[PDB]
């Protein structure tokens, strides 16, 4: 839902209480904190971009 | 605009410094000479003819003494304090100082 | 007006600065709006045939 | 299968609905304190401290919130304190209503960016309308705009008296602190007005002091407590026995020198304290301290010496009395100078009693004639609210003097927009006419809430107001009905220009901009992910 | 366990008529504590102190200030009492009673569809007329007449438990206040806190009390061979010590020769001897200081036949400085003859209850005094001390504002009728709460007749009737008989300043507590 000018933003609240609003996929993935070792490869993919 | 890394304060060496006062007039001599040292530093700055100082943050020694600040106020020199080691490259290119 | 907006503005500026960087590195552009995705889907199908 | 994040994922209508409720939960508080007919709030903390106030910003900053959408409205109020100075109630009311009505649109399959675009367009147009429908600058009203503005703000507070007792102190205190500057900047630094509290006499015995009220005491009961035609010595170094520095040691091999070197510790001090008095100084003000040895010399000399005052206070005294702050010794390799010509003046310096406490007044000062105000309440509860209420009134008058333009109160401006913007929607109404109309309709929460809090007719009182503002725009006969508002004491419309109900133009232009942008940000929080807290590591 | 998505977690909120009327009920609960401590027939309240002590009093403020509450509105009424204790003297009990009644009548209007702003507005207007009336019925005072001032203070101590010995309390307070009417520069002040010290020694009877024309301190002589009686001493006050101390440095003295160690010790002794010579250049008889006195200093002063006091407090030296006129000198090298406290009276070291007391009394013209209390125990001494502290305050009110108003309820009745006659032409919604203030004023004479056990029907109807006539306008309550006697014969007059403050505080108290529509509790502060 975050592709194109008609997409929407996400809010993420971490375990400390730091709440952010962002659209950039790189800043979303860094905060999601995905655990599964296979899906975490998508976080490294976004780093290259 | 000038960028100073020299500490405008009392003299100090890398070695441990101790000054002994062993006489009546000697106590006055220590206070008087220190004031002269700091004033002499400000005189060098004014003779160059700067208007604004950028003072780099110091850890071991006071970057600017209270006496030096008073003297610089009398010289009408404006001082910006606490410039970080990470600011120097950007400031130098932007203003042109060294 | 708000810390959440200012932080997002910082990221938005960064992206726009990088877009120009991309044009400096590789002085060529394409149409957006899905153009390369539709063109790839059609021509790659013909390749596979 | 599902997302492997160890928290909770909530999307769609779940978070979109919660965002509106969190905003409404905060708005449900402030709506009850809108207008001169509102009532005070009492807040009690965990340990038993009781705070009473009607300031919207104080209340919201004291109340704890959890949802990040509620924190935005708390910050919104803080923006009004910095940018406006008295708008700490209506800015949250407007913003929450924009969120509620926006929710009703997007639930009809209207893309959120279609609503946001309409809100930004209508907001910019609303500001254009206001700047074309202003009443008057501050030149034709003269003093009236300053007393009227002062009383209009205070009407919502515990000091909202019908008389001009407080209004005169507010306006005169601001006008007495005029400072010029380059490029036509007639500054009014109201932050320099020192406001004091005392649980003592009634509200009607507040003092307006020409000069500066210094929150300190003379101390040693042998100094003069009243000096007339005083020279004021403002300095920032301590008057005490002189200590040796950590890097200097006193190592003596001749016992005969023990007495001269030891004695010097007190002689080098007394040499200096004599020379700040040899210049004729009468009142010595220091932010440091004066030890028992040094206090003797001020008593014997017949001088006043005040110790341990704040640096922010001494700087204000020196500027108002024409003194220079001296911290050390200088003047062209001089050993001891003390800048004899740099003393200030005051017609009288006196310590007075202010209901079982002591206060030093420096009167008239002869350079800038600064101001202080001493407020009197029955108890601490009233005194705290009076200080806040006075500060608000001082700020509102400052805004009137800086921005020479007033708009009508009583909901008149919002009523005028509720008609113009509806017509605007019909000119550019292709797809955003629903967002433009809802933006305009959201504005009616102000005359609606005002009627409710006053226990007056609701849907008939406001509807009648709108009829007057309609005729001004659909019958161009110059009927001049654009300045009519609600009289909450009679339940009838009134002409706010003849009634003297004025508000600074910026109180509404800024509120519309900040309230709109705050809502737009919240309207883009459709997705929320929350991670498990880290407590014990 | 998933939490609930809440705001302001673990807090409570109350709103509406439950708060508007709830706050008034809290104020009533406070008012009933001291209701019976108004008139001359009061009874004593015995409170057990949380620190283990016992407080027996009938003073309205001393009672309420020790009562801890939880309700956030009841705290306001307690603060009103604590505030009045510092501005005025006996403006206590009547303020809590009156303020409660003003809230009581408000409760009726809040249920009659009257907006809180109408009740508050009308009350503020009534205050302007209550204050105006008090200034029109005042009585001039010639403060130089010793009998007028005696009659005033005798009335002000009648209510309190010290009245049994009024023939002593009146003279103690009147003289103490006069002695501290001190003026140095161009400003007149009456200071009954810094220079009107009250001291108490268990034992004896109240008839043994007196005002001391001077000071006393709980000190013995520095040395047994020093004089314990001096007819007219020359008193010098010092601030510095008479010992040898290290300087504020890192002093290090190199001892290398056999003579160096003992030579240093000799100079330590000589230093003390030299500075002890400096402090007799004024030829003193008595030297009082605050810090230690060295053995050599004790010997030297003994040899000079000088009596010394070792460790006197700064507040005590500040008091005697005004009794004897001495200046405290912090350097022996800067002593002047003008520093000597001449005019001092007798020095005597007395023994009271196996403890030595130093008295410096019978001074020529002191500007400070001490009141010496005696009694059966600390309990009666505590009651007498408190009542004398009030007895001095009523003098300042008259001396600074020499106007009286008839007391005994006559003031409150006259003002209630003044409001009534004006209320006839209000012709608006505020006419009702305006009249209610006039009725609320009755709570004071209503309380006075109840405390004596008299009828509340015959006295109030008759008293209200008597104030319809223009002949007297000063009828009040006879708190001893239970009948109605004009104040022109009773002579019970009260300071105008106390009556002005009573109305001002009572009205503003109500204004605050009628504006609260919501209470939110349970938050933390940073």
UniProtKB/Swiss-Prot annotation, chain B:
Per the record, the domain of life is Eukaryota
The signal peptide annotation in the UniProt record is none
Positions bearing N6-acetyllysine = 43, 57, 74, 81
Q: Where in the cell is it found?
A: Cytoplasm; Melanosome; Cytoplasm, Cytoskeleton, Microtubule organizing center, Centrosome; Cytoplasm, Cytoskeleton, Cilium basal body
The record's subunit annotation is:
Component of the chaperonin-containing T-complex (TRiC), a hexadecamer composed of two identical back-to-back stacked rings enclosing a protein folding chamber. Each ring is made up of eight different subunits: TCP1/CCT1, CCT2, CCT3, CCT4, CCT5, CCT6A/CCT6, CCT7, CCT8. Interacts with PACRG. Interacts with DNAAF4. Interacts with DLEC1.
Per the entry, what this protein does is: Component of the chaperonin-containing T-complex (TRiC), a molecular chaperone complex that assists the folding of actin, tubulin and other proteins upon ATP hydrolysis. The TRiC complex mediates the folding of WRAP53/TCAB1, thereby regulating telomere maintenance. As part of the TRiC complex may play a role in the assembly of BBSome, a complex involved in ciliogenesis regulating transports vesicles to the cilia.
* Annotated family: Belongs to the TCP-1 chaperonin family.
- Disease linkage in the record? De novo genetic variants in nearly every subunit of the TRiC complex, including CCT4, have been found in individuals with a broad spectrum of brain malformations, and clinical phenotypes ranging from mild to severe epilepsy, developmental delay, intellectual disability, ataxia, and other features of cerebral malfunction.
How is this protein named in the record?
A: T-complex protein 1 subunit delta
UniProtKB/Swiss-Prot annotation, chain D:
Reaction(s) catalysed by this chain, per the record, are: ATP + H2O = ADP + phosphate + H(+)
* Enzyme Commission (EC) number: 3.6.1.-
Enzyme class comes to hydrolase
> Where, per the database record, does this protein carry N6-acetyllysine?
197, 398, 492
Q: Which residues carry this modification: Phosphotyrosine?
A: 179
Q: Has UniProt tagged this entry with the keyword Acetylation?
A: yes
Where is the PTM Phosphoserine found along the chain? Answer: 4, 489
| Binding locations of ATP | 35, 87-89
Any Pfam family matching the protein? Cpn60_TCP1
Mind telling me which InterPro entries this protein's record contains?
Chap_CCT_alpha, Chaperone_TCP-1, Chaperonin_TCP-1_CS, Cpn60/GroEL/TCP-1, GroEL-like_apical_dom_sf, GROEL-like_equatorial_sf, TCP-1-like_intermed_sf, TCP-1_chaperonin
What molecular function does GO assign, one term?
unfolded protein binding
Q: Which CDD domains match?
A: TCP1_alpha (cd03335)
Q: Does the keyword Lipid metabolism apply?
A: no
Show the GO cellular component annotation of the record: acrosomal vesicle; cell body; centrosome; chaperonin-containing T-complex; cytosol; extracellular exosome; Golgi apparatus; heterochromatin
Q: So where does Mg(2+) get bound?
A: 86
According to its UniProt entry, the protein's GO biological process terms are:
binding of sperm to zona pellucida; chaperone mediated protein folding independent of cofactor; chaperone-mediated protein folding; positive regulation of establishment of protein localization to telomere; positive regulation of protein localization to Cajal body; positive regulation of telomerase RNA localization to Cajal body; positive regulation of telomere maintenance via telomerase; protein folding
* Keywords per UniProt: Acetylation, ATP-binding, Chaperone, Cytoplasm, Cytoskeleton, Disease variant, Epilepsy, Hydrolase, Intellectual disability, Nucleotide-binding, Phosphoprotein
Cellular compartment(s) = Cytoplasm, Cytosol; Cytoplasm, Cytoskeleton, Microtubule organizing center, Centrosome
Positions bound to ADP: 35, 87-90, 156-157, 410, 503
Q: What does this protein do?
A: Component of the chaperonin-containing T-complex (TRiC), a molecular chaperone complex that assists the folding of actin, tubulin and other proteins upon ATP hydrolysis. The TRiC complex mediates the folding of WRAP53/TCAB1, thereby regulating telomere maintenance. As part of the TRiC complex may play a role in the assembly of BBSome, a complex involved in ciliogenesis regulating transports vesicles to the cilia.
> Which family is this sequence assigned to?
Belongs to the TCP-1 chaperonin family.
Q: What is this protein called?
A: T-complex protein 1 subunit alpha
Curated annotation (Swiss-Prot), chain E:
Alphabetized Pfam families for the sequence:
Cpn60_TCP1
Question: Which positions in this protein are listed as binding ADP?
Answer: 39, 91-94, 159-160, 408, 479-480, 494, 499
What SUPFAM superfamilies does the entry give? GroEL apical domain-like, GroEL equatorial domain-like, GroEL-intermediate domain like
Query: What functional role does this protein have?
Result: Component of the chaperonin-containing T-complex (TRiC), a molecular chaperone complex that assists the folding of actin, tubulin and other proteins upon ATP hydrolysis. The TRiC complex mediates the folding of WRAP53/TCAB1, thereby regulating telomere maintenance. As part of the TRiC complex may play a role in the assembly of BBSome, a complex involved in ciliogenesis regulating transports vesicles to the cilia.
Q: Where is this cross-link: Glycyl lysine isopeptide (Lys-Gly) (interchain with G-Cter in SUMO2)?
A: 12, 245-246, 378
Phenotypic consequence of residue 9 to R: In NEDSVH; uncertain significance; the orthologous mutation in C. elegans results in reduced worm motility and a crawling speed defect suggesting a deleterious effect on function
According to its UniProt record, which protein family does this protein belong to? Belongs to the TCP-1 chaperonin family.
Q: Which residues carry this modification: N6-acetyllysine?
A: 219
- List the source organism: Homo sapiens (Human)
Q: Which residues carry this modification: Phosphothreonine?
A: 427, 456
Q: Which domain of life is it from?
A: Eukaryota
| Protein name (database record) | T-complex protein 1 subunit gamma
- Does this UniProt record's set of keywords contain rRNA processing? no
UniProt disease link: Neurodevelopmental disorder with speech or visual impairment and brain hypomyelination: An autosomal dominant disorder characterized by global developmental delay, impaired intellectual development, poor or absent speech, and brain abnormalities including hypomyelination, cerebellar atrophy, and optic nerve atrophy. Some patients have severe visual impairment, dystonic movements, and seizures.
Q: Which GO terms describe its cellular component?
A: cell body; chaperonin-containing T-complex; cytoskeleton; cytosol; extracellular exosome; microtubule; zona pellucida receptor complex
EC numbers on record: 3.6.1.-
For the ligand (ATP), the binding residues are: 39, 91-93, 408, 479, 494
